Amino acid sequence: EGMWLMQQLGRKYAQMKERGLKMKEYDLYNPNGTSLKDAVVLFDGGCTGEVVSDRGLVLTNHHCGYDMIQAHSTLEHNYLENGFWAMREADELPNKDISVVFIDKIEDVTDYVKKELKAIKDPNSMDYLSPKYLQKLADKKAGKNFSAKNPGLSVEIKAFYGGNLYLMFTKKTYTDVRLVGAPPSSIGKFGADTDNWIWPRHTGDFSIFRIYADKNGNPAPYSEDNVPLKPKRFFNISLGGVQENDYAMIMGFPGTTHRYFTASEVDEWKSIDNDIRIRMRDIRQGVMLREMLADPQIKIMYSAKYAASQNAYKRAIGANWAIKTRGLRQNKQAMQDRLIAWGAKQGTPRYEEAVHEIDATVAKRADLRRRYWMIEEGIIRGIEFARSPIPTEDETKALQASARKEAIDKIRTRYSKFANKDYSAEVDKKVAVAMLTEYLKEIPYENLPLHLRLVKDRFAGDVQAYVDDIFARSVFGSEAQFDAFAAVPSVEKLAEDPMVLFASSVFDEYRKLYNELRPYDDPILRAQRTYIAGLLEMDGDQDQFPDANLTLRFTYGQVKGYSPRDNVYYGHQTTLDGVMEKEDPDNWEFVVDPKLKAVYERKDFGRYADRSGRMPVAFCATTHTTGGNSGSPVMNANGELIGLNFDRNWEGVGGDIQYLADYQRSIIVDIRYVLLVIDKVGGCQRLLDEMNIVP
Template sequence: MNRLKFYLWALVALVMTGAARADEGMWLLQLMQQQHSIDMMKKQGLLLEANELYNPNGVSLKDAVGIFGGGCTGEIISPEGLILTNHHCGYDAIQQHSSVEHDYLTDGFWATSKEKELPTPGLKFTFIERIVDITDIVNKKIADKEVSEVEAMSRNFMQKLAEELYNQSDLKGKKGIVPQALPFYAGNKFYLFFKKIYTDIRMVAAPPSSVGKFGGETDNWMWPRHTGDFSMFRIYADANGEPADYSASNQPLKTKKFLKISIKGLKGGDYAMIMGFPGSTSRYLTVSEVKKRMEAENAPRIRIRGARQDVLKEAMAASDKVRIQYASKYARSSNYWKNSIGMNKAIIDNDVLGTKAAQEAKFADFAKANHQADYAEVVNRIDKLVAKTSPLNYQFTCLTEVFFGGIEFGNVVLSTTRQALEEKNDSLVKVQMSKLTKVFEEIHNKDYDHEVDRKVAKVLLPLYAEMVPAEQRPSIYKFIEDKYKGDYSRFVDDMYSQSIFASKANLEKFMKKPTVKAIDNDLALMYCQSKYDKFNELSKQLKNMDNELALLHKTYIRGLGEMKLPVPSYPDANFTLRLTYGNVKPYDPKDGVHFNYYTTTKGILEKENPNDREFVVPAKLKELILKKDYGRYALPNGEMPVCFLSTNDITGGNSGSPVLNAHGELIGCAFDGNWESLSGDINFDNKLQRCINLDIRYVLFILEKLGNCGHLINEMTIVE
């Protein structure tokens, strides 16, 4: 009887406590009923059953959501495989199709029929076919000494196990099926995902950047927002509806599930949930680890990316060709540059360090009360390791940001070619020579400008020297000091002009008469070898400590979960399918300031600046706004909604995710978080954290009135 009373009390406490913090959490769909998160959702306003959200034995909303490309979410909005995602998620594809002659970034793209939809090589859409709990299998292998605890969390072991289980499954040999196994809760749980990947994805619709990126870098992470951040693509499949590479005979996929679209409107307090693939969070860090994130990762990233972006921005402003080439690269870089700035600010403003310190103190009391020696020592052991790894992490961040994310040239090592020449292996030399032209083309691809990259190198090489002590730099710095008297500009000019891969003429000259001496004297090859040597050196130094840290986190997160019971815990994001629920809600960022929960097209005209590329309003859109020609998508007062806020818990990877109402109908598309919430990857703030969403009514308005794509709307099921 006492056990029953305790269980009932625990269940009530769980639901009540969950309601108090209902907006925090990236919940695993497969644990909704076990963790009672479905009960918390219903208490918040959900009008669906658990099996309508996720049904392992049937069709559910889960089957209308997938991974778009390699880092975003997309949703199916018609029975013919039509995908809705963000403009910034489709940006690579839009840029891929763009040229000075066909500038879809500036002008937009609207396919007026399926025949005009553009095949997009390399783009994929991934559904989750099945999710399997493999925790017992992994733990047995650990117990049987087949694998260590650390190895069990490694990518190599997880992939090997995934392949092993795939080969034993009924999905073996099925088209497009790819298995992936991953650790959750820092290795306390493990799941296997069977993914179904479609590779014939075609571009259907993309508004001009003056709509899809309205506000640009200035408005990124900010509210109020007026960005029409959407694009549309379509999945094509073979005659049987199975994944297939591009073929003119492929047909639009007849999807087993698509989302209905609600234009009934929304109001403050309405239930809102988001299903998607959040990329990465670190909610269970200690105080010392948060400081490491600020000082060893964010701070150097801010400085290095800022310097590179200044070079790119100037070059892009001077040339339409360069603007198109570097548009996507710049957007990717600036997004997390500004995120890092905002995160460091929000950590201080929101007293995240104080919150983490309080959690550690509470955990220490819990460990002491429960006589848990492992828990009592774990934070102190983490802190000691962090003190050792932080300086190395700082070096690693500087190295990767400059040499692997900043400077593009100098990424080739001709070690095999050199060995073949030294051994006078003529047949191997011939094979290697045949590969060099392809290597050159990969370097000098359509999105690379050698002179722009030269300018980037001239800025970043000396900046790195300012940030990293001489004894910690790659060996190329000693060479520059000795041979060039520290003149980085002269070294860069020589490398970018004289290297084998600097020009087609240089390559052809080398291929006519390849020599070991030419390879040994090549500055770009020397530079490349030195950066890889430093990368490997740092990786080796960090490996054992990172492994030890992983095991300590496994203990710490298990303990935190036990401390929170009966309230359930969710695992950190790892780009797997999650659900977050909350409400449409305004917020007050500071004293005397109130932000409403929605914006309208009125704000577009208020922000308009014809002299600022970020705030240009297309003439046709301005005409529609001035005439209030909004059709059935307007608010009752005649205004046109653009974006709205909700309390959903999202992060990168959720971009493009569907925002659903209590009936599971699509009301918007998630695309950003607010400035005040940028510490949210580390600590969720119930008062300030907001998700910025694009109102589906604005999407349909732009599609119909600006893009003249009524045929696409006719594919959809609209709920009025």
């Protein structure tokens, strides 16, 4: 059910043992010694990884190591589509701007922070959640020359439970992390966008890296002299596999949850956030689809933009399904009413006052938040020419010395980035007409961004004429129109340019709304501190976990499927057969790698097939995971690696507000399939040899 703090392992150990856990508590997490926790890393700031060998080998998702594989890919060696398999440690590719963070120590500093907070004076100061204030407190407790006296280490204090608990983290950061192996994109992204958020799933979502360090194993930036890290702890790979109901656990860095939302916040998330995103993205995607099907060149140009738009669109559909069918609003309402009833018995009205404060703030920011979401979904991300070039104050005070040619070159570079190989003005005009028509229907004249008032005032309500006029008269409407400006550039022309005026006024309103809405976050956060304090004082810190905040958490459950709808059951495990069933040679998402197809046909599964002779691919578990858990190690009852978490089913996106026992499942790639791809697809035997594999 939860995303538990490492501090809570003691309090949860008995339940985990009853659910199947066999390893000793301190072998999983030891607050003052070495444990399995020491083999978990925060990979590249937003993913999880795990050390799987005594030479610093690291496994994470394919989508986690994707940018690294893409950076080293060229026309000659396209590692993204064919995979990459360094046959020696010297061949492993270094990555610029990469990091791996070990959580060396975790300490409860609640009383220390609460005492330091007493010197604030302003009762509504947000310093209790300020990373700047909390870093000054972390530096004070660690020492003045802490990072110099402890090379590789750094400290950090994070707030938990809306400011009711504080933990200090001692982090060891390594920045020389090299690409070691990666399956082809056909395996690493098999489902691609169709199977995104979907169970059953047949994706071999993994990539291999290695941590490098100085001769003493201390963190060091990339140097040819760097040597593999001999870590204090690494995971053993289990070949025993999984069976239905088997205990499974995960350690990783879940990014964010909203477990303590009020019922009013759930209504707001549905009726504003999700409904606007769903409505606006449906209009945008509809026009893009019409155009992509009509012109194969437009399909090439807009495929990635269409897929990107579909991602949060699908998540919003899934979230609204949970609000409607799983009774999320009602359960939050029950939670707050239960607290208010208890507070009345205790003679303490501050909890009821706190829920009322959140409710009144949500009610007050409703029209503002609606306008912000309307402009963000409708214009900022909905219309490409909203992100067209806007001349800087320096550029205009250069056009009106001969640094006029420098200004035109700077504007030309931004214009080339906007009107690139993937940009179509005709498609953008069509999308803009449909998005603006919907926007003007929902946003009244008095609340419109200044330039959009011209639709009524100058164009007699003709949206198509207004959009046509923007491209016809603008210096960014076509290459010829830009070059004509570039030859005779006058500041007067830029000041009255219809596309510049549009982009400027839509961004003015977007920032104006953001600045008006920002003040409303603080009374809610302050009230949430009282609200969560009451919930914890009433039900205890045993059956309720703190919201995810990109810190190390553990979760446990069982390998199990679920019934998505009446008369349908989705089992706990997918197989290689399922990959072959989904094969479509004329669909880039479902193309099957020839070496993998041959392995399947020849039944060349070695020691990686299950007892029935079927090759496993992925499995699902009742663990509680969210974004940030990508690449998280999945463990056995004995703490051996059984797979890597890579997704969560769409029926479980609402799990960020309320865990859904009968629907929510973590989508994990079976470690047996990972080793099968390394062995029979990459032929990288040296990686299997350095891992500690248990039969």
